[PDB]
Protein backbone atom coordinates (compact mmCIF):
# COMPACT_ATOMS: atom_id res chain seq x y z
CA UNK A 1 0.00 0.00 0.00
CA UNK A 2 1.22 3.46 -0.97
CA UNK A 3 -0.08 6.99 -1.32
CA UNK A 4 -1.00 8.10 -4.84
CA UNK A 5 -2.42 11.32 -6.22
CA UNK A 6 -6.16 10.99 -6.93
CA UNK A 7 -7.15 9.58 -10.33
CA UNK A 8 -10.62 11.02 -9.78
CA UNK A 9 -12.00 13.94 -7.81
CA UNK A 10 -15.52 14.76 -6.69
CA UNK A 11 -15.46 18.50 -7.36
CA UNK A 12 -18.94 19.58 -6.24
CA UNK A 13 -21.45 20.97 -6.27
CA UNK A 14 -21.78 22.24 -2.68
CA UNK A 15 -24.86 20.51 -1.15
CA UNK A 16 -25.24 18.34 -4.25
CA UNK A 17 -24.76 15.10 -2.31
CA UNK A 18 -20.97 14.93 -2.31
CA UNK A 19 -20.63 12.92 0.91
CA UNK A 20 -23.28 10.41 -0.18
CA UNK A 21 -21.50 9.95 -3.50
CA UNK A 22 -18.11 9.43 -1.87
CA UNK A 23 -19.39 6.95 0.75
CA UNK A 24 -21.33 4.99 -1.85
CA UNK A 25 -18.39 4.87 -4.24
CA UNK A 26 -16.17 3.73 -1.37
CA UNK A 27 -18.24 0.52 -1.16
CA UNK A 28 -16.24 -0.63 -4.19
CA UNK A 29 -13.23 -2.80 -3.25
CA UNK A 30 -11.07 -1.05 -5.86
CA UNK A 31 -11.67 2.44 -4.46
CA UNK A 32 -9.60 4.17 -1.78
CA UNK A 33 -11.20 7.37 -0.51
CA UNK A 34 -9.80 10.31 1.44
CA UNK A 35 -11.91 10.55 4.61
CA UNK A 36 -12.16 14.34 4.84
CA UNK A 37 -12.62 17.25 2.42
CA UNK A 38 -9.04 18.09 1.41
CA UNK A 39 -9.45 21.65 0.10
CA UNK A 40 -6.15 21.53 -1.76
CA UNK A 41 -6.80 23.56 -4.90
CA UNK A 42 -9.14 26.12 -3.31
CA UNK A 43 -7.35 27.11 -0.06
CA UNK A 44 -4.14 29.08 -0.64
CA UNK A 45 -2.62 27.85 2.62
CA UNK A 46 -2.90 24.35 1.17
CA UNK A 47 -2.15 24.86 -2.52
CA UNK A 48 0.97 26.92 -1.76
CA UNK A 49 2.51 23.85 -0.14
CA UNK A 50 2.60 21.93 -3.44
CA UNK A 51 1.52 18.52 -4.73
CA UNK A 52 3.78 16.88 -2.16
CA UNK A 53 1.41 18.07 0.55
CA UNK A 54 -1.62 16.87 -1.43
CA UNK A 55 -0.06 13.42 -1.75
CA UNK A 56 0.40 13.18 2.04
CA UNK A 57 -3.34 13.76 2.53
CA UNK A 58 -4.22 10.77 0.37
CA UNK A 59 -5.34 7.40 1.72
CA UNK A 60 -2.99 4.47 1.30
CA UNK A 61 -4.07 2.29 -1.63
CA UNK A 62 -3.34 -1.15 -3.06
CA UNK A 63 -1.97 -1.51 -6.63
CA UNK A 64 -5.39 -2.08 -8.24
CA UNK A 65 -7.15 0.77 -6.45
CA UNK A 66 -8.36 4.17 -7.57
CA UNK A 67 -7.76 7.09 -5.21
CA UNK A 68 -10.50 9.72 -4.84
CA UNK A 69 -11.15 12.80 -2.72
CA UNK A 70 -14.14 15.12 -2.47
CA UNK A 71 -14.04 18.89 -2.01
CA UNK A 72 -17.39 20.50 -2.90
CA UNK A 73 -15.90 24.01 -3.25
CA UNK A 74 -13.80 23.13 -6.30
CA UNK A 75 -16.66 23.42 -8.79
CA UNK A 76 -17.57 27.04 -8.01
CA UNK A 77 -13.99 28.21 -7.45
CA UNK A 78 -12.75 30.05 -10.58
CA UNK A 79 -9.05 29.38 -9.94
CA UNK A 80 -9.41 25.63 -9.39
CA UNK A 81 -9.91 24.14 -12.89
CA UNK A 82 -6.53 25.41 -14.13
CA UNK A 83 -4.72 24.06 -11.08
CA UNK A 84 -6.21 20.59 -11.42
CA UNK A 85 -5.39 20.66 -15.14
CA UNK A 86 -1.78 21.47 -14.20
CA UNK A 87 -1.64 18.38 -11.98
CA UNK A 88 -3.33 16.07 -14.50
CA UNK A 89 -4.99 17.07 -17.79
CA UNK A 90 -6.46 13.57 -18.27
CA UNK A 91 -8.08 13.26 -14.85
CA UNK A 92 -11.66 11.99 -14.56
CA UNK A 93 -13.96 14.30 -12.59
CA UNK A 94 -17.24 13.63 -10.81
CA UNK A 95 -19.83 16.39 -10.52
CA UNK A 96 -23.03 15.80 -8.57
CA UNK A 97 -25.90 18.20 -9.23
CA UNK A 98 -29.34 18.71 -7.68
CA UNK A 99 -32.21 20.93 -8.74
CA UNK A 100 -30.72 24.42 -8.43
CA UNK A 101 -33.57 25.77 -6.29
CA UNK A 102 -33.43 22.79 -3.94
CA UNK A 103 -29.66 23.21 -3.77
CA UNK A 104 -30.13 26.85 -2.73
CA UNK A 105 -32.51 25.77 0.06
CA UNK A 106 -30.06 23.06 1.17
CA UNK A 107 -27.27 25.64 1.25
CA UNK A 108 -29.34 28.04 3.33
CA UNK A 109 -30.38 25.30 5.75
CA UNK A 110 -26.78 24.35 6.44
CA UNK A 111 -25.79 27.94 7.13
CA UNK A 112 -28.85 28.36 9.33
CA UNK A 113 -27.81 25.24 11.25
CA UNK A 114 -24.30 26.66 11.66
CA UNK A 115 -25.82 29.81 13.18
CA UNK A 116 -28.14 27.82 15.46
CA UNK A 117 -25.19 25.87 16.86
CA UNK A 118 -23.50 29.15 17.75
CA UNK A 119 -26.77 30.54 19.16
CA UNK A 120 -26.62 33.32 16.57
CA UNK A 121 -29.51 35.00 14.77
CA UNK A 122 -29.88 34.25 11.06
CA UNK A 123 -32.65 35.69 8.89
CA UNK A 124 -35.40 33.61 7.22
CA UNK A 125 -34.44 32.72 3.67
CA UNK A 126 -37.00 35.21 2.35
CA UNK A 127 -34.90 38.04 3.80
CA UNK A 128 -31.76 36.81 2.02
CA UNK A 129 -33.42 36.00 -1.30
CA UNK A 130 -35.49 39.19 -1.63
CA UNK A 131 -34.28 42.80 -1.59
CA UNK A 132 -36.74 41.91 -6.22
CA UNK A 133 -34.57 38.79 -6.24
CA UNK A 134 -31.33 39.50 -4.38
CA UNK A 135 -28.49 38.74 -6.78
CA UNK A 136 -25.90 39.39 -4.06
CA UNK A 137 -26.99 36.19 -2.31
CA UNK A 138 -24.02 33.86 -2.83
CA UNK A 139 -26.07 30.64 -2.74
CA UNK A 140 -27.88 31.72 -5.91
CA UNK A 141 -24.58 31.97 -7.78
CA UNK A 142 -23.46 28.50 -6.75
CA UNK A 143 -26.59 27.17 -8.49
CA UNK A 144 -25.70 28.81 -11.82
CA UNK A 145 -24.35 25.54 -13.17
CA UNK A 146 -23.84 26.73 -16.75
CA UNK A 147 -21.68 29.68 -15.70
CA UNK A 148 -19.35 27.49 -13.65
CA UNK A 149 -19.33 24.56 -16.07
CA UNK A 150 -17.86 26.85 -18.74
CA UNK A 151 -14.69 27.31 -16.67
CA UNK A 152 -14.17 23.57 -16.40
CA UNK A 153 -14.85 22.76 -20.06
CA UNK A 154 -12.00 25.05 -21.09
CA UNK A 155 -9.59 22.60 -19.45
CA UNK A 156 -11.38 19.25 -19.55
CA UNK A 157 -13.32 17.36 -22.25
CA UNK A 158 -17.00 16.95 -21.40
CA UNK A 159 -16.40 13.21 -21.71
CA UNK A 160 -14.07 13.36 -18.72
CA UNK A 161 -16.60 15.07 -16.45
CA UNK A 162 -19.34 12.68 -15.33
CA UNK A 163 -22.44 14.44 -14.03
CA UNK A 164 -24.29 12.56 -11.29
CA UNK A 165 -28.01 13.30 -11.02
CA UNK A 166 -28.23 14.20 -7.33
CA UNK A 167 -32.03 14.19 -7.32
CA UNK A 168 -32.00 10.63 -8.67
CA UNK A 169 -29.28 9.66 -6.18
CA UNK A 170 -31.60 10.67 -3.34
CA UNK A 171 -34.55 8.75 -4.80
CA UNK A 172 -32.81 5.58 -5.99
CA UNK A 173 -29.00 5.69 -5.67
CA UNK A 174 -27.96 2.32 -7.09
CA UNK A 175 -28.58 3.06 -10.79
CA UNK A 176 -26.65 6.36 -10.49
CA UNK A 177 -23.77 4.59 -8.77
CA UNK A 178 -23.69 1.99 -11.55
CA UNK A 179 -23.08 4.77 -14.06
CA UNK A 180 -20.21 6.12 -11.95
CA UNK A 181 -18.59 2.66 -11.87
CA UNK A 182 -18.80 2.45 -15.66
CA UNK A 183 -17.42 5.98 -16.08
CA UNK A 184 -14.44 5.15 -13.86
CA UNK A 185 -13.83 1.83 -15.65
CA UNK A 186 -14.59 0.02 -12.38
CA UNK A 187 -15.99 -3.52 -12.46
CA UNK A 188 -19.68 -3.62 -11.46
CA UNK A 189 -19.07 -4.84 -7.90
CA UNK A 190 -21.56 -2.69 -6.01
CA UNK A 191 -25.04 -4.23 -5.81
CA UNK A 192 -28.60 -3.25 -4.89
CA UNK A 193 -28.20 -5.12 -1.59
CA UNK A 194 -25.58 -2.56 -0.52
CA UNK A 195 -28.42 -0.07 -0.10
CA UNK A 196 -31.41 -0.11 2.23
CA UNK A 197 -33.90 2.64 2.95
CA UNK A 198 -34.15 3.97 6.49
CA UNK A 199 -37.56 5.48 7.22
CA UNK A 200 -36.25 7.17 10.37
CA UNK A 201 -33.43 8.81 8.42
CA UNK A 202 -35.66 9.57 5.44
CA UNK A 203 -32.82 8.54 3.14
CA UNK A 204 -31.04 5.46 1.87
CA UNK A 205 -28.36 3.93 4.05
CA UNK A 206 -25.43 1.64 3.33
CA UNK A 207 -24.99 -2.06 4.06
CA UNK A 208 -21.63 -3.78 3.65
CA UNK A 209 -19.49 -6.40 5.38
CA UNK A 210 -22.29 -7.09 7.85
CA UNK A 211 -22.17 -3.47 9.02
CA UNK A 212 -25.12 -1.12 8.51
CA UNK A 213 -24.92 2.68 8.63
CA UNK A 214 -26.61 5.90 7.55
CA UNK A 215 -24.84 9.14 6.70
CA UNK A 216 -23.95 11.70 9.36
CA UNK A 217 -26.75 13.68 11.06
CA UNK A 218 -25.65 16.77 9.11
CA UNK A 219 -26.70 14.99 5.89
CA UNK A 220 -30.41 15.18 5.13
CA UNK A 221 -31.82 18.18 6.98
CA UNK A 222 -35.41 19.39 6.70
CA UNK A 223 -35.62 22.46 4.45
CA UNK A 224 -37.66 25.49 5.59
CA UNK A 225 -41.06 26.32 4.11
CA UNK A 226 -40.84 29.18 1.63
CA UNK A 227 -43.35 31.78 0.52
CA UNK A 228 -44.71 30.12 -2.66
CA UNK A 229 -44.43 33.41 -4.56
CA UNK A 230 -40.73 33.49 -3.67
CA UNK A 231 -40.26 29.87 -4.73
CA UNK A 232 -41.72 30.83 -8.10
CA UNK A 233 -39.28 33.70 -8.54
CA UNK A 234 -36.62 31.13 -7.68
CA UNK A 235 -37.81 28.58 -10.24
CA UNK A 236 -38.15 31.28 -12.89
CA UNK A 237 -34.69 32.64 -12.12
CA UNK A 238 -33.11 29.30 -13.00
CA UNK A 239 -35.34 28.40 -15.96
CA UNK A 240 -33.13 29.95 -18.64
CA UNK A 241 -29.80 29.21 -16.93
CA UNK A 242 -30.96 25.58 -16.83
CA UNK A 243 -31.75 25.57 -20.54
CA UNK A 244 -28.25 26.88 -21.31
CA UNK A 245 -26.75 24.17 -19.09
CA UNK A 246 -28.82 21.42 -20.72
CA UNK A 247 -27.51 22.44 -24.14
CA UNK A 248 -23.92 22.79 -22.90
CA UNK A 249 -23.73 19.27 -21.50
CA UNK A 250 -26.12 17.73 -24.03
CA UNK A 251 -28.47 16.47 -21.34
CA UNK A 252 -31.68 17.51 -19.56
CA UNK A 253 -32.57 17.08 -15.89
CA UNK A 254 -36.03 17.03 -14.33
CA UNK A 255 -35.65 20.38 -12.55
CA UNK A 256 -38.20 23.03 -11.58
Ligand X SMILES: Nc1ncnc2c1ncn2[C@@H]1O[C@H](COP(=O)(O)O)[C@@H](OP(=O)(O)O)[C@H]1O
Binding positions for 3'-phosphoadenylyl sulfate are 15-19, 98, 106, 204, 219-223
Reference 139, options 205, 234, 70, 211; nearest CA is: 234
Residue 103 CA to residue 88 CA, distance in Å, equals 29
- Of these, 203, 237, 245, 253, which contacts ligand X (CB under 6 A)? 203
Beta carbon nearer to ligand X, 130 or 170: 170
Residue 70 CA to residue 223 CA, distance in Å, equals 24
Size of the site for ligand X (CB under 6 A): 17
Q: Give least dist CB 124 to ligand X, A.
A: 17
Work out whether 208 is an interface residue with ligand X (CB under 6 A): no
Omega of the bond leading into 13 within 30 degrees of 0 (cis) = yes
Q: Give least dist CB 148 to ligand X, A.
A: 15
Site string for ligand X, 5-44 (x = CB under 6 A): ----------xxxxxx------------------------
Question: Are the C-beta atoms of residues 9 and 84 closer than 8 Å to each other?
Answer: yes
CA separation, residue 9 to residues 41, 62, 242, 253 (Å) = 11, 18, 24, 22
Q: Give least dist CB 176 to ligand X, A.
A: 10
Which of positions 77-116 make contact with ligand X (CB under 6 A)?
106, 109
Q: Give least dist CB 102 to ligand X, A.
A: 8
Residue 12 β-bridge partners? 95
Beta carbon nearer to ligand X, 15 or 148: 15
Residue 164 CA to residue 247 CA, distance in Å, equals 17
With CB under 6 A as the contact rule, which of the stretches 112-120, 140-148, 181-189, 219-227 interacts with ligand X? 219-227
- Of these, 170, 230, 231, 248, which contacts ligand X (CB under 6 A)? 170
Q: Give least dist CB 119 to ligand X, A.
A: 21
SS3 label, residue 198: strand
Residue 130 CA to residue 137 CA, distance in Å, equals 9
Question: Are the C-beta atoms of residues 107 and 14 closer than 8 Å to each other?
Answer: yes
Work out whether 220 is an interface residue with ligand X (CB under 6 A): yes
Question: Are the C-beta atoms of residues 22 and 68 closer than 8 Å to each other?
Answer: yes
Beta carbon nearer to ligand X, 188 or 224: 224
- Note the residues at the interface with ligand X (CB under 6 A): 15-20, 72, 106, 109, 169-170, 203-204, 215, 219-221
Amino acid sequence: STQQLPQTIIIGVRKGGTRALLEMLSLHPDVAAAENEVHFFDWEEHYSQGLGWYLTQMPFSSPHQLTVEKTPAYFTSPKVPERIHSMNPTIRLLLILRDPSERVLSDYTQVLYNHLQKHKPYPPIEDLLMRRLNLDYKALNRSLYHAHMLNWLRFFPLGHIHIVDGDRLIRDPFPEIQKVERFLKLSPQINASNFYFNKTKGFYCLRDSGKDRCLHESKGRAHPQVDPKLLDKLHEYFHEPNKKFFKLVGRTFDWH
